[PDB]
Design a protein around this ligand. Structure first.
Ligand SMILES: Nc1ncnc2c1ncn2[C@@H]1O[C@H](CO)[C@@H](O)[C@H]1O
Length: 332
C-alpha cells in the first residue's frame, strides 16, 4: 500500500509476464510477493519466490507433481520457453492458476473437518514425489531429537541475557521457573527415542511424504463441489505427517483455561478418516505435542526479537504447557 512503490511492482509484473502468454488486463498486488493477474475472463497468480534457488525448485516441482497427479493445488502454467518458472536476478517467478474459494472458519465444525481431510489428502498424494536431477531434497526426517536439544540448549543460553535485565518481571519469572520446562523438554526427547520415531523416519526416507510446514486457514480454501485446496507450497519438505497435525492443533488449542478435547477429537477423527494412524504413530505425535514449542515461540519474541512482553504472557505460556501435559499424560 503506497504511491510510486505500487506502480513499481505493477511494472515488474508487466515486464515478467511477457515471458508467459497471458492477456494481462488488470494487475493487483496482494502479499514472497504475490499478484492477482486478471485476464479476459478468469485470473492467474504471479508469485515472486523469495527463498533460495535450491529450496525454490524443490517446492515448484513438488507443486507440479501434485497438480498433475490430481491433488487440489494450483497448477503451474508453463511459460513461452516451456519452463515452470523464469529467473530474473536473485528471484524466481512462477504463474499459477488462481483458485476461487472461501477461507475456513475454525469455530465451525464442518470447516475444521474439511481442513484436516485436505491435510490428509496432501500427505497421501505427496508420496512418490522426488525432485528432478540437480534439485536437492529438503528433509527433516530423523532430526527432531537434535532440534529438541538445540531448543533446550537455546533456552539455557537465554538465561545469560535474562540475568542481565535485573529489574524486569518477564526475565525474573523466566529465571525462576524455566528449568522445569527445559528438564521436561529433554525428558520428552528421551521418550521420543524410545517410540517408533526412528524406525518410522527411516522407513519414510525411502518413500517420503511432504509436510506443508505452514498449514492453516491462510493457505487453504474450500472451492466448488466442497473441494479442499492447498495454496502455498513454498515451505514444503519431507517429514513425518504428524508434524503438520501438531503444528496446526497445538496453537489452536493454546489456552490458560480448559483443554478443548472435543475440538481435538473432531480434528484427529477427520484426519484419520482419510489417513489413519497406528497407535505407535499416534504415540510419536503425542510425545512431540508435549515438547514446549509454543513456550519457545513466546520466549523468542522477548529475547531474539526484543519485544518487551509483560509477565502475564510468560505465565500464560507456562500454564498452557501444564494444561497440555495433563491432557496428554495418558497418551504418551
Ligand atoms: N492461487 C491462489 N488462489 C487463491 N488465493 C490465493 C492464491 N495465491 C494467494 N492467494 C490468497 O491471497 C490472500 C492474501 O490476501 C490469501 O487469502 C490467499 O488465499
Amino acid at each position: 500500500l503506497s504511491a510510486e512503490d505500487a506502480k513499481k511492482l505493477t511494472e515488474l509484473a508487466e515486464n515478467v509476464l511477457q515471458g508467459w502468454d497471458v492477456q494481462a488486463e488488470k494487475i493487483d498486488v496482494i502479499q514472497a510477493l504475490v499478484w492477482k493477474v486478471h485476464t479476459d475472463s478468469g485470473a492467474v497468480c504471479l508469485k515472486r519466490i523469495h527463498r533460495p534457488e535450491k529450496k525454490a525448485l524443490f517446492s515448484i516441482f513438488a507443486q507440479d507433481y501434485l497438480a498433475k497427479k490430481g491433488m487440489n493445488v494450483p497448477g503451474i502454467l508453463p511459460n513461452k520457453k516451456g519452463s515452470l518458472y523464469s529467473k530474473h536476478g536473485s528471484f524466481l517467478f512462477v504463474v499459477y492458476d488462481w483458485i476461487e474459494g472461501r477461507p475456513f472458519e475454525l469455530t465451525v465444525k464442518q470447516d475444521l473437518e474439511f481442513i484436516m481431510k485436505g491435510l490428509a489428502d496432501f500427505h497421501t498424494a505427496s508420496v512418490g514425489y522426488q525432485p528432478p536431477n540437480g534439485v536437492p531434497i529438503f528433509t527433516k526426517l530423523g532430526r527432531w531429537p537434535n532440534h529438541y536439544t538445540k531448543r533446550c540448549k537455546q533456552m539455557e543460553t537465554w538465561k545469560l541475557m535474562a540475568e542481565a535485565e535485573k529489574e524486569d518481571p518477564f526475565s525474573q519469572l523466566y529465571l525462576q521457573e524455566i528449568d522445569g520446562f527445559i528438564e521436561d523438554g529433554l525428558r520428552i526427547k528421551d521418550r521420543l527415542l524410545q517410540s517408533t520415531y526412528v524406525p518410522w523416519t527411516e522407513q519414510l526416507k525411502k518413500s517420503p511424504n511432504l509436510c506443508h510446514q505452514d498449514y492453516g486457514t491462510g493457505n487453504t480454501l474450500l472451492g466448488e463441489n466442497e473441494q479442499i485446496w492447498v495454496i502455498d507450497l513454498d515451505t514444503v519438505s519431507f517429514d513425518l505427517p504428524i508434524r503438520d497435525l501438531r503444528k496446526m492443533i497445538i496453537p489452536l488449542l493454546d489456552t490458560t483455561g480448559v483443554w478443548d478435547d472435543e475440538t481435538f477429537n473432531v480434528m484427529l477423527n477427520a484426519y484419520e478418516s482419510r489417513a489413519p494412524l497406528t497407535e505407535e504413530q499416534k504415540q510419536v505425535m503425542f510425545i512431540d505435542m508435549l515438547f514446549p514449542y509454543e513456550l519457545y515461540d513466546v520466549i523468542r519474541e522477548k529475547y531474539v526479537r526484543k519485544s518487551a512482553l509483560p509477565k502475564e504472557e510468560l505465565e500464560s505460556a507456562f500454564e498452557y504447557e501444564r494444561i497440555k501435559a495433563n491432557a496428554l499424560r495418558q497418551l504418551i
